[PDB]
Amino acid sequence: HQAISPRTLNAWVKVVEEKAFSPEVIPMFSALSEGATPQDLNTMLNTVGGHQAAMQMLKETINEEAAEWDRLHPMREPRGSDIAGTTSTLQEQIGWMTHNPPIPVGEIYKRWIILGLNKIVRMYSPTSILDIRQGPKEPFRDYVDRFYKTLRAEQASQEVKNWMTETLLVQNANPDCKTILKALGPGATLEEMMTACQG
Amino acid sequence: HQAISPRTLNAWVKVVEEKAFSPEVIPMFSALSEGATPQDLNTMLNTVGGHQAAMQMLKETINEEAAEWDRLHPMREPRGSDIAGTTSTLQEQIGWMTHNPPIPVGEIYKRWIILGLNKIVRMYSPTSILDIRQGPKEPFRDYVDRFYKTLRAEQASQEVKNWMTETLLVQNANPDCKTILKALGPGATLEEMMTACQG
Amino acid sequence: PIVQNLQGQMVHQAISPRTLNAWVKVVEEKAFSPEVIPMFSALSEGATPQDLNTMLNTVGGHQAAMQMLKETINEEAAEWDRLHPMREPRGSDIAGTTSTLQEQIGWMTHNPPIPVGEIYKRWIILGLNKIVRMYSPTSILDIRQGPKEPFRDYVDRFYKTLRAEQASQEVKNWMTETLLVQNANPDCKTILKALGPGATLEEMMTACQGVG
Amino acid sequence: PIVQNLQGQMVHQAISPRTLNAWVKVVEEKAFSPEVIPMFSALSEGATPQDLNTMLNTVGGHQAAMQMLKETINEEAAEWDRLHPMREPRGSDIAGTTSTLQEQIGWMTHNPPIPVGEIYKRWIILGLNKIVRMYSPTSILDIRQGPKEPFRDYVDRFYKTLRAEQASQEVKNWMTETLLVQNANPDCKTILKALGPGATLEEMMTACQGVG
Amino acid sequence: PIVQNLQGQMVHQAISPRTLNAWVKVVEEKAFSPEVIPMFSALSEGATPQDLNTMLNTVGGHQAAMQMLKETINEEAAEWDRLHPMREPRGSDIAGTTSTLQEQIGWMTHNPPIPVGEIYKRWIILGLNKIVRMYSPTSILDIRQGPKEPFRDYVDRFYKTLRAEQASQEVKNWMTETLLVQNANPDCKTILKALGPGATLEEMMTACQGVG
């Protein structure tokens, strides 16, 4: 067994602190927590200072997923709470991972954490995408960058996102860009839209 | 035996001096001092520059724990001071950990440090959980953040913490949010409560 | 009541003087609240018709209540004689005005027993229910929670008035479901409505604890 | 109850009318305070399931409380049948709705006795505990000592509310240790904090006598 | 209690349900006034240790009072075992936790009788005295006659507080002699002092009748 690096822990704390709960924190967490035990994941979650409302929401999501795991599955076999790391121990976790075939308790807990963090990101998105409107002289590149950051935050359905990018993206634009976008018409990819709408 | 890394030592000193004494200091210490000998733990504690009142408190609590160990427990078997590393050598400390069987001299001293840090954090918390109260205009998100930071610093049993989580969060809210939370009723979850009290 | 002899024969047991005094205190001090009927049911456990008549002699002091109690007993006796035209108990015999004590004891010891005492007790309870319905100080629609009254006190008053009114069971269910919320004070009424329809009384009381 | 005959045979003893009237007074006048459960335990000493059902007929007047009492009795009967699949007492037999009185008497006189009465009493006490938890006028966090209230009255109110709330034993211990000091008025709270943690209630009451 | 059989054998008599309910009312409604101990002595006449434990189950609802009552019973049991190292009653046997009912009945019917019930009653009374000493709302030095209070009411309050405090007999005599005069209002205090020292309470009350 290898411990998580202090550099990795500091990186996780720093990215969480600076970015709050922007959508990129999920891929950053998945990158930093590769091959991590439930003990390591619990350590990384505990070391986060601030946003304790979000961390409690994550705890409640973990508890709900553990209850679902226990309902689906009524040495000692790993229960849902055992996978969560609250009741298990490091030796048990490593044994479960080393078993052939393995019980990837780390990946299950990571998936639960990812679900909780997606819910946190959706809750913490600053404004709804309907309110993302271009300014009178804001660049179209800046406005569409903001629009797509917000759209990534919402995590709406695929069809809903398609409709949004097709219709609301041009609807919320200022008249100067809006006229050009309607001239391009429906079916235009984003590349074509803003490469024709530049300047 | 490995020497404690300068990067790890600087990280511990920086987190202590920057966060003063917050609840995250306990898991940060547990993560940094993984597989640490009593000499390494003493190095980590002594290297801290400021908060010398808190370090004296931690020394006092370590002394009390060593006295309790001496009372309960009348390669030589180590005494409390021997566990604390005040009257033991590095070779003797690696003894009882490489021994067959090994008694975890490092983990016992780490546990004592954890108890002392728990007391330090409990008192360094600004207000008690019962005294945490939402302001007339405070948003529910920041009120919840303060509440759960204080609960993390509360230093009570887990059942009592669960009761606090279910009751005091609703009880301490301002009437504007208290009415909405009562309409939600018991059985709600923090996501639903925060979405309801967003306004 | 009825008590077995030392040799197994069942013989009449006279109602104790302090039991009668307790019934007198219930009749005189309680002012015909809804709780007189539970207390009448408790004090008259196993009572024969003669004992029941002895108890009714105490409520005989009130002229109107005694009159309606007697008329209701007569009506139920007429119904009994209509359905039921030792000897068979007649309507007046159940009341204990024409029969004799040994006859009542024999009826109560039949195999299967003839529950004459329970029948007369039920008729008396019907009459007492009517008397309680008269003496209710307010109707259910006039019960309103005060601005500062706790919801527990308002619920207790509401259900006491509901017991006094004695409407139909479906009407009673509708009343407890809807009129309880309607008559609550606005701050409590908001939470009651927010709970939604079909909420159990436990949910309403837990949600509204300390709101007043 | 159960009473021995003159020749040694154990036979059912009917619950006295004034005992039932006392239970009725507890149910009707006390408004489901925490003290109803001690009084129910006292009045139902040695009671059989039939006697317990007779007592429950009086609290049957309140619809909500009766409903939850019946549902809790049903739940505990289901648990009993789960663990326990003359004849063996079934869940409905313990309640006294399907069994017969002689069967209950025989169960209570077994060697060793089958404590059917105590079991049904415990189920009823669970239901009454739930009913008391509903009717509590305030939660424990809302009990606060007044500026002039003596600490004895505040402690009595606090422990009454604690009995009404019925939290976990560890949570209850934490509450009496901490929340009692927290909710005390400032002049009394100063002495409570100065006493330090772990102080017994006797120390708190003796130190705070006359402070208010 | 204990009751003789029809053939002369002494057998255990169960404590009546309404006696237990009376004890429950004393425990719950009286708030541990000094009068609970006379009432406990009255209600527990002839009680066996099992009956006493049944009565203590009702005061078990209060955690602190039950804890000190149990610890005082344990202390007196330890003293009994120290002085006293069928079979001899042990300390736990007097409490009725280890012994059996027939053993207690046999002890109470010995020639001369072994007063186990009175011993356990005395231990319980010691514990109740301690509990009453805690719950006293004011100390004896804080009892002061009001400007308009009659001397009879002030004397009654003073002696109630004296019973609650339970000081030494010599200290109690000094208190009733001196502190009663000291705390009286000035117009009554003048007459009390003019009566001189050693005046009986009858003289003080007769002289001060109507002064307030």
Nearest in space to D77 (alpha carbons), one of D55, D60, D94: D94
Tell me how many residue pairs between chain B and chain D have CB atoms under 8 A apart.
21
Instruction: Find the CB nearest E21 among D43, D47, D152.
Output: D43
Q: How far is B74 from chain A (nearest CA, A)?
A: 30
CB contact under 8 A, B130 and D168: no
**Widest CA span of chain B, in angstroms?**
66
Strand extents, DSSP E, chain C: 2-4, 10-12
Please report, for residues B171, C118, D62, D78, the alpha-carbon distance to residue D120 in angstroms, rounded to integers and kept in the order given: 37, 26, 20, 13
What is the Rg, in whole angstroms, of the alpha carbon atoms belonging to chain E? 22
Tell me how many residue pairs between chain B and chain C have CB atoms under 8 A apart.
19
Residues belonging to chain D with any Cβ–Cβ distance to chain C shorter than 8 Å: 6, 14-18, 20-21, 23-25, 27-29, 31, 54, 57-58, 61-64, 68, 134-139, 142
List of chain B residues whose C-beta atoms are within 8 Å of the C-beta of residue C191: 179, 182-183
Q: What does chain A come to in residues?
A: 199
Quick check: A75 and A89 in contact, CB under 8 A?
A: no
**CA-to-CA distance for A119 and A141, rounded, in angstroms?**
28
The helices-and-strands tally (H runs, E runs) of chain A is 12, 0
What are the structure tokens assigned to C47, written together? 């009572």
Nearest in space to A109 (alpha carbons), one of A86, A125, A91, A130: A86
Query: Does chain E reach chain A with at least 3 CB pairs under 8 Å?
Result: no
Check whether C18 is labelled as a binding-site residue: yes
Strand extents, DSSP E, chain D: 2-4, 10-12
Which chains reach chain B with 3 or more Cβ–Cβ distances below 8 angstroms?
A: A, C, D
**CA-to-CA distance for E5 and E11, rounded, in angstroms?**
7
Instruction: Find the CB nearest A3 among B34, B145, B189.
Output: B34
CB contact under 8 A, D137 and C153: yes
What are the structure tokens assigned to E120, written together? 């356990």
**CA-to-CA distance for C67 and C130, rounded, in angstroms?**
11
CB contact under 8 A, A60 and B191: yes
Nearest in space to E130 (alpha carbons), one of C43, B178, D202: D202
Quick check: D174 and B157 in contact, CB under 8 A?
A: yes
Identify the three-state secondary structure at position A125: coil
CB contact under 8 A, D170 and B157: yes
Structure-token match 């490092």, residue found: B106
CB contact under 8 A, A52 and B194: no
Query: Does chain A reach chain C with at least 3 CB pairs under 8 Å?
Result: no
D11 - beta bridge partners? Answer: D3
Nearest in space to A147 (alpha carbons), one of A137, A135, A136: A135
Half-sphere exposure of B39 (CA within 13 A, CB side): 14
Angle between helices E49-59 and E63-83 (to 10 degrees): 150
Structure-token match 């924190």, residue found: A25
What is the Rg, in whole angstroms, of the alpha carbon atoms belonging to chain A? 22
List of chain D residues whose C-beta atoms are within 8 Å of the C-beta of residue E166: none
Instruction: Find the CB nearest E17 among D35, D45, D152.
Output: D45
Which residue in B has a C-alpha nearest to residue C203's C-alpha?
A: B185
**CA-to-CA distance for C191 and C210, rounded, in angstroms?**
12
CB contact under 8 A, B185 and C208: no
Q: What is the DSSP letter of D6?
A: T
Identify the three-state secondary structure at position D27: helix
Nearest in space to E14 (alpha carbons), one of D13, C71, C153: D13
List of chain B residues whose C-beta atoms are within 8 Å of the C-beta of residue C187: 179
CB contact under 8 A, C208 and B182: yes
3-state secondary structure string, chain E?
CEEECCCCCEEECCCCHHHHHHHHHHHHHCCCCCCHHHHHHHHCCCCCHHHHHHHHHHHCCCHHHHHHHHHHHHHHHHHHHHHCCCCCCCHHHHHCCCCCHHHHHHHHCCCCCCCHHHHHHHHHHHHHHHHHHHHCCCCHHHCCCCCCCCHHHHHHHHHHHHHHHCCCHHHHHHHHHHHHHHHCCHHHHHHHHHHCCCCCHHHHHHHCCCCC
Can you say how many angstroms the Cα of residue E79 is from the centroid of all Cα atoms in its chain?
Answer: 20
Cis geometry, peptide bond prior to residue C112 (ω within 30 degrees of 0): yes
Residues belonging to chain D with any Cβ–Cβ distance to chain E shorter than 8 Å: 1, 6, 16, 18-19, 22, 34-35, 38-39, 41-47, 150, 152-153, 156, 159, 163, 176, 200-202, 205-206, 209-210
**CA-to-CA distance for B69 and E48, rounded, in angstroms?**
48
Q: How far is E6 from chain D (nearest CA, A)?
A: 7
Instruction: Find the CB nearest D45 among E20, E29, E62.
Output: E20
Query: Does chain D reach chain A with at least 3 CB pairs under 8 Å?
Result: no
- D206 Cβ contact list (under 8 Å, min separation 6): E134
Query: Does chain B reach chain E with at least 3 CB pairs under 8 Å?
Result: no
Q: What is the DSSP letter of C175?
A: I
Resolution (A): 3.3
List of chain B residues whose C-beta atoms are within 8 Å of the C-beta of residue A51: 145
List of chain C residues whose C-beta atoms are within 8 Å of the C-beta of residue D15: 45
Q: Is the dihedral of CA C196, C200, C205, C207 positive or negative?
A: negative
Q: How far is E18 from chain D (nearest CA, A)?
A: 6
- C66 Cβ contact list (under 8 Å, min separation 6): C56, C59, C60
**CA-to-CA distance for E157 and E153, rounded, in angstroms?**
6
Burial class (CB in 10 A: 0-12, 13-18, 19+), B190: buried
**CA-to-CA distance for A92 and A82, rounded, in angstroms?**
9
- B162 Cβ contact list (under 8 Å, min separation 6): none
CB contact under 8 A, B183 and C194: yes
What is the Rg, in whole angstroms, of the alpha carbon atoms belonging to chain C? 22
Identify the three-state secondary structure at position A90: helix
Quick check: C24 and C58 in contact, CB under 8 A?
A: yes
Query: Does chain D reach chain B with at least 3 CB pairs under 8 Å?
Result: yes
**CA-to-CA distance for C113 and C131, rounded, in angstroms?**
30
List of chain D residues whose C-beta atoms are within 8 Å of the C-beta of residue B171: 139, 141
- Domains belonging to chain A, first-starting first, are 6-124 (1.10.375.10), 129-197 (1.10.1200.30)
**CA-to-CA distance for A38 and A113, rounded, in angstroms?**
11
Which residue in C has a C-alpha nearest to residue B186's C-alpha?
A: C207
Angle between helices A105-124 and A140-154 (to 10 degrees): 130
Q: How far is B182 from chain C (nearest CA, A)?
A: 6
D10 - beta bridge partners? Answer: D4
List of chain E residues whose C-beta atoms are within 8 Å of the C-beta of residue D125: none
Residues belonging to chain C with any Cβ–Cβ distance to chain B shorter than 8 Å: 187, 190-191, 194-195, 203, 206-208, 211
Tell me how many residue pairs between chain C and chain D have CB atoms under 8 A apart.
76
Q: Is the dihedral of CA B102, B105, B106, B110 positive or negative?
A: positive
CB contact under 8 A, C43 and D20: yes
Angle at B122 between CA B120 and CA B126, to 5 degrees: 110
CB contact under 8 A, C38 and D28: yes
What are the structure tokens assigned to A105, written together? 């308790």
